């Protein structure tokens, strides 16, 4: 099974190296492909109290094109300077706010934030919500094991 | 001051050991399988988070249990049930 499963993984690392490497190595790391292998680097932990979310995903300087992912301000330490950035995939912080797409009518988006989600409507913040608020379908195949009674 | 009476058949004890031995082993092995199963899914999920980005339709249809349309809406996808159509139409 594993020998078979690997064939998917060699593809998955192409699709999203960060998640694949993070799951495979055992630590939250950032990776990038360098041909037939990925380079990794440990990511710095950040407390959730030191991160604030900027409101509007619009861009005042370039109309029609606007951010695809929420913008945040984070500080490494409680007394550290406030540094701009944008939220990423599975709670990762991007220094460059380069996630720009043409603005679309009917913009309703959910983003992973902390232990829950943040919901935006028309490139504007709408509200936060907890994980339990969204129904869950299981990707796991259940297997119930009971031991022999002594 | 009493005299101890001894049963004439040790077999029960042997049975116990036998029933212990087998049991212990399986209660080990199956348990390992359980863990081995668990991590698998926990590991497998990392593939799925990519697959849903490729075509949310098939992924949602397989995971939910009904043929549904899906569209990726940020970090989560929205689904909608799909109506049947006869093959002659």
């Amino acid at each position: 099974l594993q020998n078979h499963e690997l064939t998917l993984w060699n593809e998955a690392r192409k699709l999203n190296p960060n998640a694949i490497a993070s799951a495979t190595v055992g630590r939250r790391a950032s990776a990038r492909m360098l041909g037939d292998v990925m380079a990794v680097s440990t990511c710095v932990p950040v407390a959730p109290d030191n991160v604030i979310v900027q409101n509007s995903m619009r861009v005042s300087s370039r109309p029609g094109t606007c951010y695809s992912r929420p913008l945040v301000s984070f500080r490494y330490e409680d007394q550290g300077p406030l540094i701009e950035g944008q939220l990423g995939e599975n709670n990762e912080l991007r220094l460059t706010r380069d996630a720009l797409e043409p603005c679309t009518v009917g913009h309703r988006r959910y983003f992973i934030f902390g232990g829950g989600y943040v919901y935006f409507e028309e490139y504007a913040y709408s509200h936060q919500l907890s994980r339990a608020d969204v129904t869950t379908v299981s990707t796991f195949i259940d297997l119930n094991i009971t031991m022999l009674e002594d | 001051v009493e005299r101890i009476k001894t049963t004439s058949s040790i077999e029960f004890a042997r049975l116990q050991f036998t029933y212990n031995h087998i049991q212990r082993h399986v209660n080990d092995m199956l348990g390992r399988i359980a863990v081995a199963w668990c991590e698998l899914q926990n590991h497998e999920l990392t593939l799925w988070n990519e697959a849903r980005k490729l075509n949310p339709n098939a992924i949602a249809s397989a995971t939910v249990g009904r043929r549904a349309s899906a569209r990726m809406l940020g970090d989560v996808m929205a689904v909608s049930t799909c109506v049947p159509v006869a093959p002659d139409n």
Partner: peptide
Amino acid sequence: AQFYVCPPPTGATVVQFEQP
């Protein structure tokens, strides 16, 4: 041997995968 047809989904119905 039967077909399925359906429009794009709406934001009303949202579903997430289970965490480990």
